[PDB]
């Protein structure tokens, strides 16, 4: 159920080469909170990749610590998928965490690397969050 302590979800960004604004994925619930993948271009140059948590809530008392693995799927060989691990205490003043320079933009969009196809790039996140605080008293 949504109370699950961990989960893995993906988000495929279309017309990736033309990305200009930051894109948001639908929500994935774990620990009963909405988690999303956030992608945006940073300086062409590099791919910004972040994990967002409970950002829609107007609450300022909640907090949830989690560890996750942020990965950019390589459709030609998952062994060549690039991923980085994170650990962070999520709360309103820091509802997202990740890397603004997660990968080189020219590399991810390289048709010969196997990360991009039909101008689509799939993002995956494996999050393992602890019980939250300041939410379900």
């Amino acid at each position: 159920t949504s109370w699950r302590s961990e989960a893995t979800f993906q988000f495929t960004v279309e017309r990736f080469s033309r990305l200009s604004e930051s894109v948001l994925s639908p929500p994935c619930f774990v620990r009963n909170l909405p988690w999303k993948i956030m992608v945006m271009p940073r300086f062409q140059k590099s791919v910004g990749f972040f994990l967002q948590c409970n950002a829609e809530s107007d609450s300022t008392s909640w907090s949830c610590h989690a560890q996750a693995v942020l990965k950019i799927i390589n459709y030609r060989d998952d062994e060549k998928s690039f991923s980085r691990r994170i650990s962070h205490l999520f709360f309103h003043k820091e509802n997202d965490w990740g890397f603004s320079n997660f990968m080189a933009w020219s590399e991810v969009t390289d048709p010969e690397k196997g990360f991009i196809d039909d101008d689509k790039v799939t993002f995956e996140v494996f999050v393992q969050a602890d019980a939250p605080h300041g939410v379900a008293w």
Binding site: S22, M38, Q52, E94, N95, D96, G98, F99
Partner: peptide, 7 residues
């Protein structure tokens, strides 16, 4: 690189 928030 080093991790942070999108902000």
């Amino acid at each position: 690189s080093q991790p942070s928030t999108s902000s």
